[PDB]
Every structure is written in C-alpha cells, then in structure tokens.
Amino acid sequence: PDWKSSLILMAYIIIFLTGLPANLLALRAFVGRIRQPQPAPVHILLLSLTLADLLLLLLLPFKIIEAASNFRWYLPKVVCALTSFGFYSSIYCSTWLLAGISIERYLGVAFPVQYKLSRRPLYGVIAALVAWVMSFGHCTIVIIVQYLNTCYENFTDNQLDVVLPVRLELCLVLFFIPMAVTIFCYWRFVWIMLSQPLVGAQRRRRAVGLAVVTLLNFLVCFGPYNVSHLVGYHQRKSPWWRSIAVVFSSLNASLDPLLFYFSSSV
Template structure:
C-alpha cells in the first residue's frame, strides 16, 4: 500500500513539474534566443540560454519517467531507450550545476570589477563556459550507458517486464558507486562551493553600495536565494544518496524520491531567470497579458476591464526599464 502511494505521489510530482516547467522554459528560450542574436551578447545570456536548454532536455525526457512511474517502476520500452533517456536525463541535471556556478561567477565579476568586466567580456567566454559544462556532464554520465550494457536492467516477471537502472548486481555496483561519488564531488560540491562564495560576495556588494536601488537589491537577494534553493533542495538529496550509497555499498532504495527533487530544478529555474534577466521578465509579463486578454475574451468582459488591462500593460512596460540584465555598477 505504501509503495502504491509513493508511486502515485511521484507520478503527480512529475506531471506538475512537466506542466509548469515546459511552458515557462519555452518562454525563457524565446527570450534568450532573441537576446543572444543581438550584437555582442553578454556571456551571462549564453549561460542562461544553455541552462534553459538543459532544463528543456530534462522536461522532454520526463514523459518516459512518467510512463515508468505509472507502470510501478517497470520498464516496458526497449532497453536502448532506457539507456539513452537515463543518459540525457542525468546529464541535464549535472550540466545545470556548473552552468549555475558559471552564472554566479559572471554576476560576481560584474559587480566586483564592473569596469574591467565590461571592457573584457566577450560572447566567446560564455560559449566556452557552456561547452565545458555540457562536456563535463555528458562525459561523466556515460556511466549510464556503460552500466546499461552491463545488463543493469533486471528481469522482473517476464522478458517484457524489466526495471531501468535499478536492482544492480554486485559487479554493476562496483562500477556505479565510485562514479556516483565522483559525480557528487566534481559536479555538485565544487560548483556549489563556487556558487555560494560568488553569491555571498555579490549580495554583500549590492547591499553595501548606497547608489544601488532597492529594486536591484531585492532582485540580487532573490537570485541568490533561488540559486541556493536549487542546490540544497533540488540537487542536495540526490547527491546525498550518492554518498550514502558509496558508504553502504548499495544503491539506496529511497534514491527514486531524490530524483524527483532533482527534476524540480526544471520548474525552479524559470524563477531564477525572472530575477536574472529583464528580457525574461518582459516575456513572462507578455505571456500573462496574453492569458489575461484571452480570459477576458472568453468571459466577454469589456468596457472597464478592457481599460484596466490596457493600463496594466503600460505599467509593466514602464517598470522593466532597459533591456540589460547585468547587475553591474557602471
């Protein structure tokens, strides 16, 4: 009974993450694509675009996990699909950690050394940082493919009823557990330490400089808080399972729950995008305006409400200000 309730809750969580994360990340993707197409885009926009693509990769693979969860964690699709979806799914999770660290470094340099940073920043730096994050994550997560072809899928009832990336043999654990430990150290603890240091300095500078406006200070604090929640709530439990598994020489049975928290990252990142970039704030504002107009049309609201909507639209455009999303002090 408990296992059934657990499957139902996990299934519900995956569906909510998919329904909330996909439209928000698609809006962010459209905004960042428009921004990077402009001359000399800032490295942060390239990193934010890469983070959006990582989230979309996870979300596009999430339906496979939904199907697996709805089947009580039995895998009825071909084994190669298990290997490829697992490879892309876990790679996108760990790609996000170093991209978040790169964004924190960019933010810190932008406020700590505003003049030097503005003179030396190049779009190429953002491209190189994004490529490094993708190569590191996909390179490390090749273990998913390796273990899959070591017969990581275990026969459950019949040849068409198997589990995906679970129920490891001892030989498979000898490969999986050390690699998971390395993943935790290289792709979680190190980028988290970098991110905490950079955002600590970033927020301190933003709060102590008198000429920084209250709105920018609030956005700076919000950006740091959301990023910290990403590491602690989304990535933390999943990587703790790696440490516990390596210590106990087994794959923890509660690891499946931590994967749900890691998936939540795809729904939490759009909040980070909102605090981080004015182009995303405008895109979200325009999306809300479209929904508001459609709702008014369906309910046949006219007259006064139409005037209120028009007035609200003007208010949004006036508060956004310049298109720059940099937290620089120039």
C-alpha cells in the first residue's frame, strides 16, 4: 500500500468501474447484431473480443485485492494459478482477436469483392476459435507442464531457467505474429484509404484516424508487457515493472468498447 502500489489500486479501480458497464452494453449490442440476419465475420470477432474483455474484467477484483495486499502474500492459495492464468489468457486472446479484426478491416478495403463473396459467419467463428485456442491452449499447456514438476510473482533461480524460455516463446511466436499482422494490415488499410478518391476528408479521416488510434492503443497496451519478457530474458530476472506492464495491458480491456462500439453512436 506504498505510493506506486496505491496508484496501481487507483488505476485498477477506475479501469474496472469505467470498463464494466460499457462492456455489458457492447456485449449486448454485439449479441443483438449477431442475432440479426446475415452477420459478418468481423461481428463475431468483435463479439469474441468483448467476451474476452468481459472475462478479464471479472478477474480484475482478484488483481485489485492482491495489489491491496502489497501485491504479495495472496490470502487464497489454489486460486492464484487460476486467476493469473485466466488474466494472461484473456490478454493474449484479446491480442489475437485484435489481429483478426485488423485482418478483416484490411480485407474489407483491399479485397472488397472477395470479402463480399466470403462474408460468411463460419469463417468468423473459425477465426475466433483459432485465436481462443492459440491463447488458452498455450496457457493451459504451460500451466500443465508447471504442474508436472504470491500469484506467480516471486520465483527461484531454478524456476527462472524455465520461466524465461516460456516468456520468450510467448513474446516471439504468440504476440509478435499478431502484432506484425496488425501493423501490416493497418498500415496497408491507412494507405489504401488515403489513396481512395471517392470519399473526401469529411469521412475518410474518421476511418484513418480511428485505425491510427486502434494501432496506437494496441502498441501501447500490449507492448510494454510483452517487451518485459525480452527484458527479463536479457537480464535473467523477473522485471519489477511487470505490474504496471499488466496494468497497461489490461487498459485495452476497457478501451476496446470505446473504439469498437461507442464510436458509431458517438
């Protein structure tokens, strides 16, 4: 409960309070749009993203009370490995769903005929399932191999020799690929919309700026946490700023409905 920890509690409280009701409204609207005839794959991807954000929000109180206990010596024992697993799986699932939404946005403006022809919700379900697998199954096999041998904060030098390769893999093959495809697709989309001589600056800007803000939010939320993995591997120690890193990573769970649902109505 000292300075930085108090700031962490304040930030967690404000993000939870600001992101919950917006998440319920966005989830209800996305479910309703799914129920409407002829849904699009991007609608299912948005629904999956808001579901992952909601599940992350439901796991926030555990993090806030853990931080209230000086971010250590968590009172429960068998719930750390579940809450942290769910939190990190939700973070990575949100990253992959953001990458999928970026791919859909790039397809909708660079391959319009093909996107219209293949606008079938089955592909959206398949993409959402692929993202969900690539996050949750990775976290599950990691926790399983952990069980084949507070709340994942302090380790020993023996444990680091296993933790660091896992973090390196999670940053290199589980985050860099979604980050790379998101950056490439959004860059191509922005260039295409800036080279489209149909809609003037009165409405194309509203899409170019939205894409730029989405890419910036992605690189600001999911960036520091993941580069913390490389930093920890380089210095062979657990980074001390992992708490603020995961705070920034979870900030996207509340900022997502602002950029995906509350932009049309506002």
